[PDB]
């Protein structure tokens with residue numbers, strides 16, 4: 632039993648909800664919140680910009696120190712950093728950005744990072760400003776993640792499409 636509320640069960644381990652991941656994280660304080668990161672951890676917009684704003688820019692400060700020490704992530708890769716006031720940990724995961732021309736086949740590799748954590752709150756990787764088809768991303772999530780994933784979907788219209796079209 633966990634604290635997530637109001638989710639629709641898609642499979643044994645994948646759940647979905649129309650919700651703001653920022654407000655959801657603040658309420659649940661999950662062990663792991665997933666950020667839709669880029670390889671430079673520049674949290675300027677989309678989910679990353681929103682998560683970082685909620686931390687009063689502390690996420691960005693921590694991220695800049697991480698990059699200065701370690702260099703950029705790989706597309707498809709991840710790192711674990713602090714969750715600040717939102718969660719215990721933030722798993723920064725780099726899905727391919729279609730608007731940069733990156734291989735969508737890397738979306739599966741990106742979702743594989745979720746399997747290192749028993750329970751996560753997360754967005755659809757590569758959705759939104761990353762330009763991928765969210766129906767394809769939900770499909771990859773369901774077919775790749777084996778741990779318990781709670782998806783927050785910001786747009787009410789997109790969610791209903793995701794639920795109504797889910798196989």
Ligand SMILES: Cc1nc(C(=O)N[C@@H](CC(=O)O)c2ccccc2)c2cc[nH]c2n1
Nearest residue numbers: 652677678681754758759783784785786789
């Ligand atoms: C869960 C979540 N998602 C996003 C986000 O950018 N979401 C994409 C995908 C989607 O609909 O979830 C989007 C695509 C088209 C229109 C609006 C949003 C944000 C931004 C701030 N907080 C968030 N929380």
